[PDB]
Design a protein around this ligand. Structure first.
Ligand code: K75
Ligand code: K75
Ligand code: ZN
Ligand code: ZN
Lengths: 369, 369
């Protein structure tokens, strides 16, 4: 048998850490990047291709799947893993952020809202969110939080989220199958305010979670501000548990966040911007639709080990994306997700060899040249 | 070394034949179905996936590739095979039909036309079409024909096409690299008129080609009429060369056309209707968007050996197509192309075992139940 959840730090450099999370469905190498699979698919990739790029875990969403195709329906069909054909760990967001981003009525009990898809009306609460995530069969369950710049007011939302974090913990612990086979993460709130971040961290650590996410970022704050908040926020979290930065981000954001103690990441940038023609390279991103690539026989990136860069030219991918061909989206997406995973591998290896500081400097010098 | 073009008939049953075409880039099992790759991609499939389904040869188009990305450009980038990553045979249509279907001025010299894409003006002729197909590096080159129901008038178009067939032959034979490494097929015209089909067949056989296509069908004539035309048209063609029915078709069309002596087929139905939610099965086509499939855990087809049917349920593919997800198009397309190839395999095996008559009866009884 394998453990439910065991995080082990193998090496450190400054605030950066590298290690593993062992879970029943597999091992997660940290720092980790999670491709986003909101609609029970990582867009334009088979799950075998997601795995081939190096991903150990993907992200799903309570909000989208409760609406389409439905949580109880996925459970009847055998759970999210069987449904989409990914047999490794899945982390699910709780719905707190997506309900706010995508027609809502807030209270201490929870949120009622109108779906952006049907106009149908629905409810979420800590207890319903945890139940939905159980029905999906998520391996890492997120606590349900209230999400809203803010006064002052940020403290009201943070304090409610901490009350909801306790209800999430209790709902999770009441479901034996969940508590024995899954892990539960809390979400730190408090916006840009050091004192509220501390109050939030204290509340979560008093409750106790398997891991701690940093919420309230990647919402348009600029990298300077995000780094400032991480500087004081991450040290407040339990050192011996994973630290998950929700929604981040660009390669340069990921590197700086690892320098500040983050272990886990998710964002739509590699998939969405790949479909839109943006390819990541070690010399910075390029827009493959640009006419300069029409006769370029080189691969998207000259060092990348992915299957796309072993077989097809920039010129061919340029043609596909210009033509609106599905294979264009497929190849751009595979390459970008592989690039993100190779970035994470380089981060892990450099921390384990005690040269991550030098890697970060070298990476930024070339990427921004 | 391998032969330029060697067709060998291994078994016959009635007018049906099964065998092989050996070419420098591989062997083509007949009767053969060619997936369509008009824009230098079989839509939503990597070439390795096209091959995995059983395809021996794919179809490309002079008309689309001369416009985007351009014939001379593809040649500079190393040819169509290298460009799209398919290293097996490619048959290219000559442009005669697509120029008519997709703003044109006809003459004995050729056709000038306005592109449906740019509005730019272009010319095609027998000599330019053959040159374009040389630049692409096509393995089976189609003669350039004039295409237009018709009086009477059908005879005018047919006779010009026969003059253009001779010019196509001469242009091909003037290009040593082409004549040594590629094959050339002629196109029989004459519409529904037995006497014109005979005049056309005579003209083509006097010129001499590696294979003979039956043109002027799959243009909305109904299956009864198509079969009537094949009944008298295919016997007019040289028995010892392949017979190619352009643009056909539905599974039931393919079976009946093999019964009448056709060896080669192409159509967009499995790819295009797959993206639109139609899946082929041995019990007939189904529309996977229908609500009856929302909780159906069976595969698309209960006997199909394709990778899609080994891993994912109807319910999951239903969800993907309803959501507009790219993976939906990918999986539907792989399954439909695999189904077509399994149909062709069953046809070949039954002819080689002398039970094709029984297969056709059994196939129709189940498919149309
Ligand atoms: C306050 C707060 C907060 C966090 N709460 C929940 N439940 N999910 C998140 C997802 C995020 N995605 C992005 N940017 C794309 N920032 C996020 C923040 C959260
Ligand atoms: C008269 C005539 C004729 C043939 N001539 C050339 N060059 N290409 C063809 C392609 C076809 N596609 C379909 N149906 C989709 N019928 C076709 C017929 C032709
Ligand atoms: Zn790559
Ligand atoms: Zn199948």
């Amino acid at each position: 048998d394998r453990p439910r959840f065991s995080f082990s730090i193998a090496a450190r450099e400054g605030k950066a850490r590298t290690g593993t999370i062992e879970m029943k469905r597999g091992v997660i190498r940290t720092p980790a990047f999670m491709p986003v699979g909101t609609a029970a698919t990582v867009k334009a990739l088979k799950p075998e291709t997601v795995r081939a790029t190096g991903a150990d875990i993907i992200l799903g969403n309570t909000y989208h799947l409760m609406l389409r195709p439905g949580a109880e329906r996925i459970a009847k069909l055998g759970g999210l893993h069987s449904f989409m054909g990914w047999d490794r760990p899945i982390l699910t967001d709780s719905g707190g952020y997506q309900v706010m981003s995508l027609l809502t009525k807030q209270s201490e009990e929870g949120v009622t809202f109108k779906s952006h898809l049907d106009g149908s009306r629905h409810m979420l609460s800590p207890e319903r969110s945890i139940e939905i995530q159980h029905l999906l069969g998520s391996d890492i369950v997120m606590a349900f939080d209230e999400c809203t710049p803010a006064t002052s007011r940020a403290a009201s939302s943070m304090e409610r989220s901490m009350r909801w974090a306790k209800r999430s913990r209790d709902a999770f612990d009441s479901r034996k199958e969940q508590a024995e086979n899954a892990a539960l993460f809390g979400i730190q709130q408090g916006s840009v305010f050091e004192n509220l971040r501390q109050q939030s961290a204290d509340a979560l650590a008093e409750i106790g979670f398997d891991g701690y996410a940093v919420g309230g970022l990647a919402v348009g704050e600029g990298q300077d501000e995000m780094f400032r908040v991480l500087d004081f926020s991450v040290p407040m979290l339990p050192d011996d548990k994973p630290h998950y930065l929700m929604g981040v981000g660009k390669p340069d954001d990921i590197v700086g966040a690892v320098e500040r103690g983050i272990d886990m990441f998710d964002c739509v940038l590699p998939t969405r911007s790949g479909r839109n023609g943006q390819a990541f390279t070690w010399d910075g991103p390029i827009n493959i639709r640009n006419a300069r690539f029409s006769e370029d026989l080189k691969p998207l990136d000259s060092e990348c080990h992915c299957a796309v860069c072993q077989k097809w030219s920039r010129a061919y991918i340029h043609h596909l994306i210009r033509a609106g061909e599905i294979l264009g989206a497929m190849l751009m997406t595979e390459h970008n997700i592989a690039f993100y995973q190779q970035l994470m591998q380089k981060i892990r290896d450099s921390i384990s060899e005690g040269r991550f500081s030098q890697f970060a400097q070298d990476f930024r010098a070339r990427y921004f040249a």
